[PDB]
């Protein structure tokens, strides 16, 4: 099968498998697993931060960033369209009792700075006292705007509230857009990363922040069922992701290109200038009978294409040509 | 004091005071108050459903709604202006783990586009279980034409449909359709007693019985339980007897209250004058505490009751006409 | 109908009603009622807290009160037949987030060796911020000097001290101390008003400025902010002010009616105020006599005389 | 170091890694990967259940399971001692809003406790709806007899049944019945694998297909839905089938180790010592620092012997000798 449903369906390499082979493990509760602490110390470093959590999904991820940050009743104002408020079965709210303000986000994971600011609730009991403010880059396969995310901090500085990113694909916006990760996370006071999806590691996500912040996210692990024994097996495969997989996601983003180039050019319509990383969103002018067609032949999807490592040249030639066939 | 800012500032006339001195009281929590009993009798009565049950406030009447509809991580559908959505402590959701869903809320009604694109079976997602309206959003009367719509989209997906009618009388009046008329749309509905009927304390939640005895399970554990509530009860019963076709005379103050300043640097809209409030713009900080000193009180916003009368409106449109 | 289920069927008295019908009454939600503020200002006063906060029910000013010390995942430990735990349908977990720890009860007093060992730093347990005590718990009067060895453990532990004073006046006036002296070891009391004091309905939640202000928030969640609530504050500031004295012929009249039926199980030291705990269908003969309680448990209150106590004495040696 | 403290620092085998090293994955939300369908699949059949679910940890799967039985204001009654009240943060009430029903705890549950713990109907109460036991209970094993009395009590009342069943596979071999034996009289029963079975991460849910169902939906709320998760999901299924056998060994050795200390100063007695536990008091502080000098480590003090815990470890005793 050609996959492009999701780029969460990455299978590990043959090194990324040998490496956890050599995986030395200890027990995590007692915090002597030397893989998942190795990886937590690497993570914290990498994104500049004070310390790390490692967790096996990113939406426990962002279930515990939202609950460090907010208090039962406490606000956390967030995109409509954001994961964490849509696709999480809202848990920070069911779970957590954290009061979620949607607001409406736009193309790029920007949520207006007037949507926010009229979001922010004044020191009143008909209101929640908000707390923190969420973001997503990538959003979509889109690049989160690096100018506009300066001036929701100031935005953020001007309330004394907290600012947390869901970075499940933010290496993808670092590779596209040639900004470090340093610079693309400097303005969150915490940021998700999932290693589970583009970077190949086949279970995990990393919460990252300050001492005091990941210390309450740990707690709260614990208390969801977060709290692993011999986790360095998946620790490691995810610091292998980390150091080895970074790179080549321009790879990822070429095809998704390609792919992109090629059936632009045909009863579809697409956006050529959305496609900035490994995601290409396109329609009919329906669906149906496409999704079987492409089955048949052996490939898989749901108008959104994404491109990753198992994924090659002759993958996206072949999809083309399905698309070219069904004209 | 002139008070415009909110009808809920309404004084027990003598009359009611009066019902509450010699209202019989018993226990509440064993139903054998009289007068608790009997205006939760005619409450449901008056709008044709099963059973009703008497609460201290609105914000409970709600709470108890949309959690006796709505269990842990199930989803209910609201405006985002609604008042249970930003006006109570999204209460429903830190205590009662329900599932927030707010949409667009333009009039008071929800695009049915947006209801149904909200509604949601899958991991990633709420179950919606429930449907939202405020009969009276800011004073604005919800059409009829659009209740009978809204209806039949929760009925495809078998959801149920709740109204915060905290003003639901003011729209009774104004709009000249029946109570029944304008709940039998609704699962659930959840009357004021506190704002423009002139009862002291309380409000009605009123649905099925097995409804209602969820709803009567949850107030004993939010604390809404009371004793000898009797004489809340009965002051209740006598506004809904006695204080209902004089909230006409709420909106010809106001329908006099906008006249009277619109023919003014004032930018308000005559359209949206249906019942009790007058929504205005300045073309603010100033203004009000220059009305605080000529004993006038409100918030843009100017919602006229029994205590607001007809030398009250002219003494409010004149202290304009010397502000500007 | 001689009621003897409870002290809570108390009805208003004409005096009471009276004061109903002058009471001022503004809007609460601004805090613009006269009656409320009046009601809050001397219930502060009379327990020497910096606050206090009117509620509609015994119940919410536990929920609050609990709430308002314990945050999601903070642990709170009680006594296993206490009210907050046992009768109020574990509110404050199931709303609140709080986790409960229900330690054996022994007089109403929790040893303070299981309270000890319920105190939790670590991953597997609940961080504890707070112990509940009950004053009285079923009639009996919780014991002066154990309140002090209590805040002693509190302040060791950097803990809160809540007090379930439902029925506080009653061990008031049973045991000969002062409201002052039952209160000063509590961080926070509830008190009920509709109950021995015999006003309709609430209850008042007392502690600091702080304390109070995270409870009046709390409040308005849980659809406890009412509009014209100076009626009822003010048959509460009555009951406060004219009903405590008299808790002493309650406390009289349920001796008495226990010596008449101990005569006939029953334990006389256990009668220490208004309650009568009895042991050997029974209930369907007296209802039909004119004399109704639970069961096992019988309450006497202000609308209880003399008479009535003969009566079912008369009623009880009959069967 | 000779490591005592639990049997959750088990490593894994060359074997088992070797296992893990040719473990076929797949995407387990879409439901794909082939490692932990099999499991599952085996976990099920193995226990004579309908559906099982991989899970994180034991907490995450108890914590599910209760979530699973028991909606908000729902009540299950469980032992004191027991972990899901003791030792998970409360999480079932923290976050699930269910209400935990602590009971005194061979770590049997007295069913007059229970009989009496079971809320009446009425608005005071919470309605009850599981009851929790664990098997094994601080290496106790639950005797079969008051396991078949208690579900007589549990179909009186028409409440379900779940077993946090972290050790099982201990109490099964050392009672001589088999899993389906010990697993019969449950509605859900929740298994460890990185404990005694020697796996590196996880736990097995397993119940109803109805039941299992709701903890799937669960468990993506929680966090517990994993990408690739073959991998451990398969040294999982290795531990299962290649490491049940073996635990007679672990009750061997802490037979063994009971026996030698049992030493003067040194309290215990050997009927509590069933499975691969022993409790032991002295006549505390200065022992754990004396025995780490010497590389031996533990947790009155507790001691768990397992995979890597060979004879001449069980060496403990002498030092035991030699410090007394
Ligand atoms: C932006 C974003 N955030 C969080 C998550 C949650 O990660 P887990 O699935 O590991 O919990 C996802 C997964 N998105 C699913 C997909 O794109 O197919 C995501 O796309
Ligand atoms: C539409 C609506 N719904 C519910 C409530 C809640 O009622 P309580 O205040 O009794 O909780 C209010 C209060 N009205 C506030 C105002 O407009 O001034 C309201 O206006
Ligand atoms: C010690 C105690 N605490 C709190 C309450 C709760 O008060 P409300 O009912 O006002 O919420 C009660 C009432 N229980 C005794 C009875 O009802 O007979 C009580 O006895
Ligand atoms: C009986 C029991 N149940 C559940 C758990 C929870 O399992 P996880 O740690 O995988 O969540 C434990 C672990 N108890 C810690 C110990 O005995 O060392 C346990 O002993």
């Given at each position: ?38 990886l937590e110390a690497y993570g914290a470093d990498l994104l500049?931060?004070?310390?790390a959590?490692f ?138 990363i ?12 990393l919460?990252v ?29 995810g610091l292998?992701?980390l ?85």
């Amino acid at each position: 099968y050609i996959d492009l449903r999701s780029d969460t369906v990455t299978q590990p390499t043959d090194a990324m498998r040998q490496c956890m082979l050599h995986a030395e493990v200890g027990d995590d509760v007692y915090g002597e697993d030397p893989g998942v602490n190795a990886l937590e110390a690497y993570g914290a470093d990498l994104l500049g931060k004070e310390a790390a959590l490692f967790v096996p999904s990113g939406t426990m991820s962002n279930l515990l960033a939202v609950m460090s940050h907010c208090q039962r009743g406490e606000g956390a104002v967030l995109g409509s369209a954001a994961h964490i408020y849509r696709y999480e079965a809202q848990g920070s709210a069911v779970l957590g009792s954290v009061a979620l303000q949607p607001v409406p986000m736009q193309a790029d994971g920007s949520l207006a700075l007037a949507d926010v600011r009229a979001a922010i609730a004044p020191d009143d009991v008909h209101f929640t006292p908000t707390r923190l403010v969420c973001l997503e880059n990538t959003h979509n396969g889109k690049v989160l705007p690096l100018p506009y995310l300066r001036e929701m901090r100031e935005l953020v500085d001007e309330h004394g509230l907290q600012l947390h990113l869901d970075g499940a694909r933010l290496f993808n916006a670092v590779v596209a857009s040639g900004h470090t990760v340093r610079e693309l996370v400097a303005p969150f006071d915490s940021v998700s990363i999932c290693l589970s999806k583009g970077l190949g590691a086949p279970v995990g996500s990393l919460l990252v922040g300050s001492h005091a912040f990941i210390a309450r996210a740990r707690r709260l692990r614990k208390m969801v069922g977060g709290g692993m024994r011999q986790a360095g097996i998946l620790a490691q495969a995810g610091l292998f992701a980390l150091q080895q997989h970074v790179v080549r996601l321009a790879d990822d983003h070429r095809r998704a290109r390609q792919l992109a180039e090629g059936l632009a050019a045909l009863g579809i319509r697409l956006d050529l200038a959305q496609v900035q990383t490994n995601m290409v969103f396109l329609q009919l002018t329906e669906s149906a009978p496409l999704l079987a067609f492409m089955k048949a032949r052996g490939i898989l999807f749901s108008l959104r294409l994404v491109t990753h490592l198992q994924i090659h040249d002759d993958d996206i030639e072949e999809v083309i040509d399905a698309f070219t066939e069904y004209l």
